[PDB]
Every structure is written in structure tokens, then in C-alpha cells.
Short mmCIF file of C-alpha atoms and ligand atoms in Angstrom, two decimals:
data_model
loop_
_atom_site.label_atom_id
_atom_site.label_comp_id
_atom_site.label_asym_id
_atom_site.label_seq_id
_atom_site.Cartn_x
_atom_site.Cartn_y
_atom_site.Cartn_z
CA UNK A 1 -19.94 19.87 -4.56
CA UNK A 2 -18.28 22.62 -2.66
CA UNK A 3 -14.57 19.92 -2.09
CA UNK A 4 -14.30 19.77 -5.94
CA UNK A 5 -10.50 21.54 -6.72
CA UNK A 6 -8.71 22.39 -9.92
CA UNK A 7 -9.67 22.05 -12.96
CA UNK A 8 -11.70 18.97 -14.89
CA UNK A 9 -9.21 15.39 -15.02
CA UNK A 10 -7.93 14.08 -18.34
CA UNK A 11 -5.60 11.25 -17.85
CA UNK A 12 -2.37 13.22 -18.24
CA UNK A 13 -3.40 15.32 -15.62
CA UNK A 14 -3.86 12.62 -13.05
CA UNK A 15 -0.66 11.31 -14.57
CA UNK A 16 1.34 14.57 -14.00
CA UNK A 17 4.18 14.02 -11.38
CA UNK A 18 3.10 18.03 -10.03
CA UNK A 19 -0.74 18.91 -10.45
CA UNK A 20 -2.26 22.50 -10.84
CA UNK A 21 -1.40 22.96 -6.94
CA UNK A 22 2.16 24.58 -5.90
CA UNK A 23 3.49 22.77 -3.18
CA UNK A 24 5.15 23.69 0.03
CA UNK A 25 6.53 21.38 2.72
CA UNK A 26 6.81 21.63 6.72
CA UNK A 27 8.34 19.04 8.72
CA UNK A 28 7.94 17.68 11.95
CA UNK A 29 10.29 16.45 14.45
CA UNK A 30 10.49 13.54 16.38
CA UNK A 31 10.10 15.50 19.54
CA UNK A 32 7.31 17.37 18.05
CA UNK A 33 5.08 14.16 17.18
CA UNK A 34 2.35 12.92 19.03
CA UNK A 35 1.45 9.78 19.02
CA UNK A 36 4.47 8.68 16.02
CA UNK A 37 8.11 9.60 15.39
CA UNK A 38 7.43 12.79 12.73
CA UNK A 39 7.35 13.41 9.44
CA UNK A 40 7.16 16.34 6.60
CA UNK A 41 3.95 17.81 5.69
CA UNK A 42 3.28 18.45 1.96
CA UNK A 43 0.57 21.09 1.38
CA UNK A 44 -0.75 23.43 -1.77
CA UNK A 45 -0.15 27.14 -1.16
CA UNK A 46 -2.82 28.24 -2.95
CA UNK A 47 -5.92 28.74 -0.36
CA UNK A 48 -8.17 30.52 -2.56
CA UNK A 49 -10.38 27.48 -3.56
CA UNK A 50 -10.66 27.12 0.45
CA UNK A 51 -9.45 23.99 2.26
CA UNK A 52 -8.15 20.20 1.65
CA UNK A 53 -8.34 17.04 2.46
CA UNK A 54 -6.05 15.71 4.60
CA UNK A 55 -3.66 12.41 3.65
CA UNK A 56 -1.43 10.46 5.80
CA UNK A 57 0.80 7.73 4.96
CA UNK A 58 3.19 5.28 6.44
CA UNK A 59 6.63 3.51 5.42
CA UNK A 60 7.13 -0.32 5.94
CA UNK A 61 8.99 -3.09 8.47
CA UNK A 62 12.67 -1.03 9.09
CA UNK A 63 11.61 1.48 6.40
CA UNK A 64 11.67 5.39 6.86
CA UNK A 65 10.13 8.49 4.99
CA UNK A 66 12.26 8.33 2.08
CA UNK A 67 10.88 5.31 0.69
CA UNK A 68 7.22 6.93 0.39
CA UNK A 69 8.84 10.80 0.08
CA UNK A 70 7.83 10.73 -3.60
CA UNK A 71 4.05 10.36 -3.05
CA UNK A 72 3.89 13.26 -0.33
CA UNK A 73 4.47 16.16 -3.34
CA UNK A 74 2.96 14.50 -6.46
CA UNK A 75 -0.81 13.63 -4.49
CA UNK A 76 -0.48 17.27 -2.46
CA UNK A 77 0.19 18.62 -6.10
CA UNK A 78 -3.34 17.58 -6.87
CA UNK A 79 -5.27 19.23 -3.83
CA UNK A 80 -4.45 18.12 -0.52
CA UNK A 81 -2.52 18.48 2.76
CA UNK A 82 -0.35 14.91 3.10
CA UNK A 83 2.44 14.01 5.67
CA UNK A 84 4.74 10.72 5.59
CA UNK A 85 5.36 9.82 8.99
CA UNK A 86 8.63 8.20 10.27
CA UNK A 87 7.22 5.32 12.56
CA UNK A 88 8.31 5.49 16.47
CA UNK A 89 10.70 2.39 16.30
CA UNK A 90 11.68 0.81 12.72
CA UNK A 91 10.12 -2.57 14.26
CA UNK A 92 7.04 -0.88 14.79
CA UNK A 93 3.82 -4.04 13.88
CA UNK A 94 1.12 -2.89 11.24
CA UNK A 95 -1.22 -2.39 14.41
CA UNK A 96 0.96 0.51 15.95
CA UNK A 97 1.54 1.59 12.13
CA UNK A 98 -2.70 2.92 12.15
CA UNK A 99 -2.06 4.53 15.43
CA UNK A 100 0.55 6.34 13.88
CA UNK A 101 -1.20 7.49 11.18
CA UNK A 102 -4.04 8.53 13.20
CA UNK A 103 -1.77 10.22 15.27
CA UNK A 104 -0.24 11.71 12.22
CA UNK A 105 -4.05 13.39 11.00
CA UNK A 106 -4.66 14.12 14.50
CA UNK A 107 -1.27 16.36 14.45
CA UNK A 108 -2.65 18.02 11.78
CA UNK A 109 -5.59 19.70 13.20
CA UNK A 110 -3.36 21.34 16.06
CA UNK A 111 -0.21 22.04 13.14
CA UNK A 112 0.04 25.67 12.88
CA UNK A 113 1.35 26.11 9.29
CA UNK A 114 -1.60 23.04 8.03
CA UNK A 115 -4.63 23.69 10.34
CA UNK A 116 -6.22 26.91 8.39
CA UNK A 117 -5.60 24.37 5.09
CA UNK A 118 -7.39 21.71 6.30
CA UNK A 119 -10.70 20.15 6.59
CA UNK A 120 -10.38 17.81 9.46
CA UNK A 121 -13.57 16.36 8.54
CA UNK A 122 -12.26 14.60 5.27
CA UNK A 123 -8.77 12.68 6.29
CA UNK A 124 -7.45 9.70 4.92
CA UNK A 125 -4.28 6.70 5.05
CA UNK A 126 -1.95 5.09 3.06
CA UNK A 127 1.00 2.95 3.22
CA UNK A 128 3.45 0.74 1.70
CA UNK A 129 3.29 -3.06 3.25
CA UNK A 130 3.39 -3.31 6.24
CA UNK A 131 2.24 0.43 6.42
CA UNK A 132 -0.62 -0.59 3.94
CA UNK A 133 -1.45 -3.10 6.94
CA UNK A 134 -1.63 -0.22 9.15
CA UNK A 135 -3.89 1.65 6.80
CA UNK A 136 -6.31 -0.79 7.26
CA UNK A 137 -6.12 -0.98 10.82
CA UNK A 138 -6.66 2.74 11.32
CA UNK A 139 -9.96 2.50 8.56
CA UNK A 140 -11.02 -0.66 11.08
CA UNK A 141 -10.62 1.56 13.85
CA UNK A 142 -11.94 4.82 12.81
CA UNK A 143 -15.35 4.73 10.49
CA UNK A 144 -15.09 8.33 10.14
CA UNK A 145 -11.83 8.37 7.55
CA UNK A 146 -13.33 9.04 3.98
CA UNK A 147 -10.44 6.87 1.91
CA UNK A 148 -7.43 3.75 2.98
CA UNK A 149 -5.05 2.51 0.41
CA UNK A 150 -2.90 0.13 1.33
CA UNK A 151 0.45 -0.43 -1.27
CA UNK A 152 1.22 -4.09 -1.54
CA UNK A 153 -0.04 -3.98 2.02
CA UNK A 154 1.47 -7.23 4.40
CA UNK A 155 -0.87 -8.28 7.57
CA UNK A 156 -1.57 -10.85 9.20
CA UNK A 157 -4.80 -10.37 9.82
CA UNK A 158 -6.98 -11.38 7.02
CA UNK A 159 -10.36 -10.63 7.64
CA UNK A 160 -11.67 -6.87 7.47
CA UNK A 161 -15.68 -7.10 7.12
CA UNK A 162 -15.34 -4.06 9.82
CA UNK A 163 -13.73 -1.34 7.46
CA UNK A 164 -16.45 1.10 6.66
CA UNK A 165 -13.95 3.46 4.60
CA UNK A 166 -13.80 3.33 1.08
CA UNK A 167 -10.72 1.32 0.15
CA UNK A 168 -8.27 0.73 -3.00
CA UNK A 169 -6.18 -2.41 -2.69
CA UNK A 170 -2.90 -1.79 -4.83
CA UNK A 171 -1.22 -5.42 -5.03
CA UNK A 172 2.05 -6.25 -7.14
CA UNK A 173 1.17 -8.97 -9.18
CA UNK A 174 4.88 -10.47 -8.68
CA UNK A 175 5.34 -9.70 -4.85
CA UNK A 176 6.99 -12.23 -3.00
CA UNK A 177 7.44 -10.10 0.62
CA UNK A 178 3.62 -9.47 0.46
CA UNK A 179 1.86 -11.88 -2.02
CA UNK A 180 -1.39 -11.04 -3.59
CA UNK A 181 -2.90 -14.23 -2.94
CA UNK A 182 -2.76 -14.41 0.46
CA UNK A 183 -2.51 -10.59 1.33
CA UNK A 184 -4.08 -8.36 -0.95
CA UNK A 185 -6.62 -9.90 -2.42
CA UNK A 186 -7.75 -11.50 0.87
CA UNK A 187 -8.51 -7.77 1.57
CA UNK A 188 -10.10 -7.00 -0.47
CA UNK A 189 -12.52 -10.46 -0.53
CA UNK A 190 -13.05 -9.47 3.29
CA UNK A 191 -14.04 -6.09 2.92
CA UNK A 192 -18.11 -5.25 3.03
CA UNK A 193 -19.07 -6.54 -0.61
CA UNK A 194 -21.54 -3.38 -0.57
CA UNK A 195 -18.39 -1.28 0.71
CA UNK A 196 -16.61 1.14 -2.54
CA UNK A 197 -14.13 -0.64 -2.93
CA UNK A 198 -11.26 -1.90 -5.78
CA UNK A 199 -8.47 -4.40 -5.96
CA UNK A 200 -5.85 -2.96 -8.70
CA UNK A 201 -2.90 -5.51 -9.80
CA UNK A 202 0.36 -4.16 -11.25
CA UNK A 203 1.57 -6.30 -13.54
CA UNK A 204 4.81 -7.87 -13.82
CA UNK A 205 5.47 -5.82 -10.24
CA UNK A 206 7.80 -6.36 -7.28
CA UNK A 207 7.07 -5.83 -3.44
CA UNK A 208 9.40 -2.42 -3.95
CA UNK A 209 7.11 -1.00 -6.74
CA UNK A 210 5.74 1.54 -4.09
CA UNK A 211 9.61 2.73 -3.30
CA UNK A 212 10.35 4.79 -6.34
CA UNK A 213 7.54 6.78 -8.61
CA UNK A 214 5.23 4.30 -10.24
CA UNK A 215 2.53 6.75 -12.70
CA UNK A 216 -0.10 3.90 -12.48
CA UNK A 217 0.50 3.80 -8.41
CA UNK A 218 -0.08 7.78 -8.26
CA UNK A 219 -3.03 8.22 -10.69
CA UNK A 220 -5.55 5.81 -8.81
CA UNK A 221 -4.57 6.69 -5.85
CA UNK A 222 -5.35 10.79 -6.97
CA UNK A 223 -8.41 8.87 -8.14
CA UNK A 224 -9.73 7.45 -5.13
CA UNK A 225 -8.30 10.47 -3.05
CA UNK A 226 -10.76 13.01 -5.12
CA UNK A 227 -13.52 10.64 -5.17
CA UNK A 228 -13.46 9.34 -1.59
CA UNK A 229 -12.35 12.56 -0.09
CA UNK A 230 -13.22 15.00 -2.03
CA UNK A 231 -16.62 12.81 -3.09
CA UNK A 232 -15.46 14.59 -6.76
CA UNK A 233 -17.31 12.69 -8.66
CA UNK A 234 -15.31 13.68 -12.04
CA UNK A 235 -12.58 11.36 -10.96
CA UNK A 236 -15.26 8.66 -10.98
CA UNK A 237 -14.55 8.02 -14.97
CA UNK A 238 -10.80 7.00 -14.08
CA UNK A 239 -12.24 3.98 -11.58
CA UNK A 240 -15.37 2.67 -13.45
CA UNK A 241 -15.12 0.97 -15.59
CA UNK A 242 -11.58 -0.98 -15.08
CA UNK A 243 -8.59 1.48 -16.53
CA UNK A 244 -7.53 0.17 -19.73
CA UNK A 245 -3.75 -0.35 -18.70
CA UNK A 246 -1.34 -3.07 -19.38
CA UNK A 247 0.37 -1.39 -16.02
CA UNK A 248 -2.56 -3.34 -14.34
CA UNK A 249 -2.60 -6.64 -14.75
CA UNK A 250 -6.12 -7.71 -12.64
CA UNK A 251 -8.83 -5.49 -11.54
CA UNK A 252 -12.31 -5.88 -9.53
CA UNK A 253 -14.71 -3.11 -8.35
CA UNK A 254 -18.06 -2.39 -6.86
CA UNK A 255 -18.23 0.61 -9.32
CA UNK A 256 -20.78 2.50 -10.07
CA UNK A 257 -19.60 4.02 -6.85
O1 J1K B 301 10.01 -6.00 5.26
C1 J1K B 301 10.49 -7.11 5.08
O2 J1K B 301 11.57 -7.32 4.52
C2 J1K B 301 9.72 -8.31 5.59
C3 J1K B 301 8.93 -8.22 6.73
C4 J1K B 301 8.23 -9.31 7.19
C5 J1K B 301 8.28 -10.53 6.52
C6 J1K B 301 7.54 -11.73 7.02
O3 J1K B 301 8.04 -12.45 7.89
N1 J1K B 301 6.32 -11.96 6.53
C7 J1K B 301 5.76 -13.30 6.46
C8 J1K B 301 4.26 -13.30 6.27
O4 J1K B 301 3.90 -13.43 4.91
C9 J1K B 301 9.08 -10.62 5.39
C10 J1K B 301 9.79 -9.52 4.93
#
């Protein structure tokens, strides 16, 4: 596996707020932005190992970057090239909010400080809520994109037997903006039953769990990010089986992946 970077995963290490990875950021203005309303690019300075996977991901309903900042950094820290995107307007529907990621990776093949770190080939999306929403509707619109993971995601569209992109479904088992029941875990239900895929429940979690750094949130989603993306199959021990954490409160996969 030529993707496979840094060293071997213990837990701690897909715990660690920083990976092996120094960091550097770029931003991008609103003017600058194709396609969304900018954002700040997180990548690893370190090009010796060659080039990274590419992450985008996207705020919620009147939310900006600064409720997501915290994720750009810690998963870059790990191995890859990720930019939080400000959406166009702060109304912007969870349909706009995958164009604007999509945008977002497509910026990133053209960015001059990012586009000799990246492997456009391997891009994925996140989000928080209705962001999450729009992670899905990017993976239903784009086969191609290698990982979604949508954070307490809020849609109203329930059904997604079109996603072809492996996808973790991070619900808060206490979220009343977003509930599991009708939201997450009707994602996950309606994804391919032969698709890789997981449903992970925080326990005892609010809809604002995504907000500020949540360990449990980062690890699986470095997880899935180095499996999926990187097809690293060394992060495969952290997904199957379930995680043994009281942090998760329900979990369902299609593992062995
Ligand atoms: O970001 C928020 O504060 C928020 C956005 C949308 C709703 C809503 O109307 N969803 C109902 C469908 O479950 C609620 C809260």
C-alpha cells in the first residue's frame, strides 16, 4: 500500500489531539472560492512520504468555520490536506452544503500552496448537521469520493441506497436538533447493506458534541479517513470489531471491511 503514512496506530495515537504530521494552514477568501464562501486549509509540511488525501468539511444551519476549526488541525495532524469551508449564505440547505464541499475539493486541485500535497484521486466530506446532510449529498452525487461522515447529520431526505462511498454515521445519542431515530440511523438503514459502512452512537451526547473537541469524535473519524482514503488497512483494528468505549453508546457495522 503505497497511501499508508506515519507510523503503525495504537489507540493513543489516534487519540492524540496533533499526530506525527506538523501542520501548516492557508486560508481562502470569500472572493477566492469557487463554488462556496472560503475557508482555511490545514495541511502536513512534511512531503517526504509523498502526497495526501484530501478532506473537506462543512459547518451547520447559521454556523461558520469556527464551530468545526478544531477538526481541520487534529485529522491534518494525522496525514492529510483538510479545509473547513464557510458556506455562501448562513441559510445555505444541506443540498447546496455538498456542492460546497465539492467545490471546496475541487479548489484544492487548482490551490497553489495544496495542489503538489495532494492526491486528487482520494478526497473525502464531512460535516456537522446540517453539513453532515450535505456530506451525504455530495457522496450521492459523486461515486468517486473514497470516505463521508456526517456529525449528528440533519436531512430531510431519508433514503440514501445511492451512496457508493464508504460512510461513518456519528449520531449523539441525546440529540434533540438532529435525533438519531429519525436522522442518523435512518442513514445509515438506507445506505447499500453491502456498502462499508458504521453507525457510531455517543452516549449521553448533545446535538453540539461536534462544536468543541470530542477524542471519541476525532479517533473514528482518523479511522475511517486512513481506511477509506488511505485504504490503510492498519486502522482496520480500531473499526472491527465495535470499539470498546463507554463514549459510544450503540454501534453497527458491515466490518470485516
Ligand atoms: O440549526 C438549528 O438550530 C436548527 C435547524 C433546523 C431545525 C429544524 O427545523 N429541523 C426539523 C427537522 O427535524 C432545527 C434546528
Amino acid at each position: 500500500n503505497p497511501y499508508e503514512r506515519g507510523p503503525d496506530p495504537t489507540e493513543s495515537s489516534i487519540e492524540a489531539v496533533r499526530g506525527p504530521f506538523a501542520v501548516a494552514q492557508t486560508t481562502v477568501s470569500r472572493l477566492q472560492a469557487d463554488g462556496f464562501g472560503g475557508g482555511t486549509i490545514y495541511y502536513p509540511t512534511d512531503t517526504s512520504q509523498g502526497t495526501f488525501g484530501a478532506v473537506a468539511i462543512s459547518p451547520g444551519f447559521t454556523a461558520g468555520q469556527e464551530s468545526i476549526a478544531w477538526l481541520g488541525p487534529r485529522i491534518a495532524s494525522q496525514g492529510f490536506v483538510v479545509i473547513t469551508i464557510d458556506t455562501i449564505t448562513r441559510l445555505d440547505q444541506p443540498d447546496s452544503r455538498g456542492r460546497q464541499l465539492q467545490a471546496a475539493l475541487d479548489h484544492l486541485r487548482t490551490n497553489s500552496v495544496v495542489r503538489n500535497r495532494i492526491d486528487p484521486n482520494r478526497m473525502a466530506v464531512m460535516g456537522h448537521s446540517m453539513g453532515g446532510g450535505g456530506a451525504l449529498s455530495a457522496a450521492a452525487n459523486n461515486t468517486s469520493l473514497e470516505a463521508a461522515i456526517p456529525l449528528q447529520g440533519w436531512h430531510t431526505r431519508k433514503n440514501w441506497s445511492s451512496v457508493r462511498t464508504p460512510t461513518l454515521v456519528v449520531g449523539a445519542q441525546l440529540d434533540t436538533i438532529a435525533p438519531v431515530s429519525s436522522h442518523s440511523e435512518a442513514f445509515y438503514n438506507s445506505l447499500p447493506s453491502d456498502l462499508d459502512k458504521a453507525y457510531m452512537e455517543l452516549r449521553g451526547a448533545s446535538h453540539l458534541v461536534s462544536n468543541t473537541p470530542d477524542t471519541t469524535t476525532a479517533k473514528y473519524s482518523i479511522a475511517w479517513l486512513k481506511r477509506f482514503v488511505d485504504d490503510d488497512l492498519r486502522y482496520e483494528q480500531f473499526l472491527c470489531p465495535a470499539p470498546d468505549d463507554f463514549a459510544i453508546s450503540e454501534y453497527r457495522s458491515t466490518c470485516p471491511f
